C-alpha cells in the first residue's frame, strides 16, 4: 500500500521537519508507505493555513499532520470536526474534547501544579505568553483557591523589538517592588533565552530567587549561563537522553548528518521535534493496525471538498479516528498512550534541578505517581554552606581584633 | 444603484436581526440602496462562518455585516485580513489590529478601570466568561502589579 499524508508544517521548525524525515527513514516499510504532502505557510495566518489544508485535503490524504497555534486552533479542528480528516500534532493540547485530533504534547498543568506544594509556596510571580494559550493563567487562578495562592501574572508577551530593553527593565522593577523571590514563567522554548538574558544582565538570579520554566524540554537552553547564579531554576523534562531505547535514538540522531538533516547533529533535542518521531510512530502503527484489522483505506478517487455545502464526511475517516485511538507504543516520551478523546494518558514527566554541577532529576510525575521524589542521587551531599545572618553591635557580634586581615 | 452587502447572524440573535432590518428599513435612502444577501448559520464553530464567508464572498458582496465568538474570531480577522474585503462587528473587541476590521463595540476597559479607581478597591474577586476574550482578565490582572490590587480570578 501507499498512503499519502498532509504535512501543514511550521516554517521555522527544520529541526522538526528532520524529525520528520528521520522517523519515516525508521518507520516506512512496503506494506504501506506513508507518503509525504506537506506545504510550509504562516501557522499564524488561519486563512494561509486553511487554504493549504484544503489543498492537501483535495488530494484526499488519510491524515494530516503538523503544527498550530492558538491563532488557528479553532480554525483547524472545526474543519476535523466536519470533515473527519484524522489529524495528529505535537503541539500545544486544547482544553477541550474532540475526535480526530491527537493531541501529542501532554499536559503541564498537572506537573507543574503539583510543583507548586512540593516547593510549598503561597506567594509567586508569574509571567506568561498568549501563544500556548492562558490555560495555565486560568488553571493556575483557577487553583488560587484550594492553597489560597497570592499570585501576580503580568503579560510578559507583548514585549517586541521595538523597546525589548526597557520593557523588561520595568518589568523586573514591578517585582522588586513587589520584591517578588519565586518566580514562575510559561514562555516557549524560543522565547525563555530573551527573558534569561536580562534577568542576567540586571542580576537577578542569586540565591533567594527561585525559578520554573514551563517547558517540557527545560534542558534545551544556555542553562548554563545562569547555572552560576545560586537561583534554584528547575524545570520539567519528557525527553530524557537517559534512557537507553531512547538513547539509542538519541545516538543515531546525533550522529547523522548535520546539514542534510538541518541541526539534528546535536546531543540534544526540542521535544517538540522529539515527539515527531512518536506522533510519525503512531500514524504507522495504525496503518497497521488498519491493515492488521483487515479494514481497509481503499477509498473514491475522489478526494471530495472541504467547503462542500452542505459538506458531508466519509465513513472511512471514522474507521482511522479509531486506529489511531487504539495506538499504544514506546517512543522518545515513553510508553506513550490516548484516551478516546484524543489526549494521552500515562505520560510520565521528570523535575530536574539546575544544580551548578547541570540540571539533575529530582523526581518524576504522572498522574497517579504525583510527584515522586528522586532524590537518592548525591550531587549536592557534603553540607553545602549553610549562610548565617545577623547584625555588628558589642559585644553580642565583633570584629575580630585582626579582621582587616581576616 | 445598490450595493451588494452580505450579512451572518448568529442562531438566536433574533434581536439583533430584527434590528438590523430595522436599521435597513430606517437609513435606506432615495439615492441609493443596499442589496443584503444574509445567512442565518451556526457562529459558534468556524466551518459555518468559513463556508458562508466563501459563499457571500463569491456572491462579490463588498461589505459584510456579521458576528463572531473567540472561537471563531481568528477565522474572519485572518480572512480579512487577507483578502481586503472588510468585516464589521459589535462582537468584543480583539488584542490585534488588523486591517479591514469595524470592531465597534467600544472598549470597556478603561472605563472598568478607572470605576475601580473610584472606588478606590484594593481586594476583591474578579470573574470571568473565557469565551469573549481575557483582554479585561489580562488588563485587569497586568494593572494589578501598578495599581497593586489583591485579584483573584
Not at 542553562?223 to 534512557?243: H, M, R, T, W
Request: glycine fraction near 8%; charge should be negative; proline fraction near 3%.
Amino acid at each position: 500500500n501507499s498512503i499519502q499524508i498532509g504535512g501543514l508544517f511550521p516554517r521555522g521548525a527544520d529541526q522538526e521537519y528532520s524529525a520528520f524525515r528521520v522517523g519515516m527513514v525508521q518507520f516506512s516499510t512496503s506494506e504501506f508507505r506513508l507518503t509525504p504532502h506537506i506545504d510550509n505557510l504562516e501557522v499564524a495566518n488561519s486563512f494561509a493555513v486553511t487554504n493549504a489544508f484544503c489543498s492537501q485535503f483535495s488530494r484526499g490524504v488519510y491524515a494530516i499532520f503538523g503544527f498550530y497555534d492558538k491563532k488557528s486552533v479553532n480554525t483547524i479542528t472545526s474543519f476535523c470536526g466536519t470533515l473527519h480528516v484524522s489529524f495528529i500534532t505535537p503541539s500545544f493540547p486544547t482544553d477541550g474534547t474532540h475526535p480526530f485530533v491527537i493531541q501529542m504534547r501532554p499536559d503541564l498543568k498537572g506537573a507543574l501544579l503539583s510543583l507548586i506544594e512540593y516547593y510549598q509556596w503561597d506567594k509567586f510571580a508569574y509571567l506568561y505568553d498568549s501563544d500556548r494559550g492562558l490555560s495555565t493563567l486560568q488553571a493556575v487562578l483557577d487553583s488560587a483557591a484550594e492553597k489560597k495562592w497570592q499570585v501576580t501574572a503580568i503579560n510578559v508577551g507583548n514585549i517586541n523589538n521595538d523597546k525589548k530593553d526597557e520593557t523588561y527593565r520595568s518589568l523586573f522593577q514591578d517585582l522588586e517592588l513587589k520584591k517578588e523571590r519565586r518566580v514562575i514563567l510559561d514562555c516557549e522554548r524560543d522565547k525563555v533565552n530573551d527573558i534569561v538574558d536580562q534577568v542576567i544582565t540586571i542580576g537577578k538570579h542569586v540565591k533567594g530567587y527561585h525559578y520554573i520554566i514551563a517547558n517540557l524540554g527545560f534542558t534545551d537552553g544556555d542553562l548554563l549561563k545562569i547555572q552560576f547564579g545560586g537561583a534554584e531554576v528547575s524545570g520539567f523534562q519528557i525527553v530524557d537522553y537517559d534512557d537507553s531505547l531512547v538513547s539509542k535514538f538519541i545516538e543515531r540522531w546525533s550522529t547523522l548528518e548535520e546539514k542534510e538533516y538541518p541541526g539534528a547533529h546535536t546531543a540534544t533535542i526540542k521535544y517538540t521535534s522529539a515527539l515527531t518521531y512518536d506522533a510519525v510512530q503512531v500514524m504507522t502503527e495504525a496503518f497497521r493496525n488498519l491493515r492488521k484489522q483487515r479494514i481497509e483505506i481503499s477509498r473514491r478517487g475522489n478526494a471530495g471538498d472541504c467547503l462542500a455545502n452542505p459538506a458531508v464526511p466519509w465513513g472511512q475517516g471514522v474507521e482511522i479516528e479509531r486506529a489511531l485511538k487504539q495506538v499504544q507504543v514506546e517512543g522518545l516520551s515513553g510508553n506513550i498512550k490516548f484516551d478516546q478523546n484524543g489526549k494521552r494518558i500515562n505520560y510520565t514527566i521528570n523535575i530536574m534541578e539546575l544544580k551548578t554541577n547541570g540540571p539533575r532529576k529530582i523526581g518524576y510525575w504522572s498522574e497517579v505517581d504525583k510527584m515522586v521524589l528522586t532524590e537518592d542521587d548525591t550531587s549536592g551531599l557534603e553540607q553545602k554552606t549553610v549562610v548565617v545572618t545577623t547584625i555588628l553591635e558589642s559585644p553580642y557580634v565583633m570584629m575580630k581584633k585582626n579582621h582587616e586581615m581576616l
